[PDB]
Amino acid sequence: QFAKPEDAVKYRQSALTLMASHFGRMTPVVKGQAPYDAAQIKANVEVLKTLSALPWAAFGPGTEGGDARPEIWSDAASFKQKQQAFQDNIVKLSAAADAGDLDKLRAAFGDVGASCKACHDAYRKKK
């Protein structure tokens, strides 16, 4: 869906920015600094589920650019494993949110965040 590589870059950056807002806005809830409304979090995690599937199709071959390491492209199976571990962690977060369980939510949230960081450290250029 991208006319030029720059368009894929802009899409994935926007997707990741959203995904990041929908993940990070739950930090006060997971920490107890904001109240836990199970329905609110269920709905937000559904949004996050949708968003978390979107970035990956915008790293199609030859779309080097942005802060993406070339290592994404030449190690496709392995990048795919990082992506797929992250979404299976998102599945677990959805299960916790759907269950309405703050303890399970906190644990699952931590696992997701670790998976964000794992891909970051391997595949996101240093600033």
Binding site for heme c, by residue number, is 12-13, 67, 116, 119-120
Report the alpha-carbon distance of residue 22 to residue 49 in Å, rounded.
10
Q: Does 13 bind ligand HEC (CB under 6 A)?
A: yes
Q: Are the beta carbons of 9 and 17 closer than 8 angstroms? A: no
Q: Cβ of 41: how many Cβ atoms within 10 Å?
A: 22
Q: Are the beta carbons of 84 and 9 closer than 8 angstroms? A: no
* Nearer to ligand HEC among residue 32 and residue 60 (C-beta): 60
Least distance in Å: CB of 38 to ligand HEC?
A: 21
SS3 of the chain: helix, strand, coil, percent, to 5: 75, 0, 25
Written as six digits, the tokens of 56 are: 């990956």
Q: Does 76 bind its own copies (CB under 8 A)?
A: no
Written as six digits, the tokens of 21 are: 């807002």
Least distance in Å: CB of 68 to ligand HEC?
A: 4
Q: 43 contacts which partner out of ligand HEC, its own copies, none, CB within 5 to 8 A by kind?
A: none
Q: 98 contacts which partner out of its own copies, ligand HEC, none, CB within 5 to 8 A by kind?
A: none
Q: Does 54 bind its own copies (CB under 8 A)?
A: yes
Q: Does 14 bind its own copies (CB under 8 A)?
A: yes
Of the candidates 3, 10, 23, 31, the one whose C-alpha atom is nearest the C-alpha of residue 116 is: 23
Residues forming the site for ligand HEC (CB under 6 A): 9, 12-13, 16-17, 19-20, 23, 66-68, 82-83, 86, 112, 115-116, 119-120, 123-124
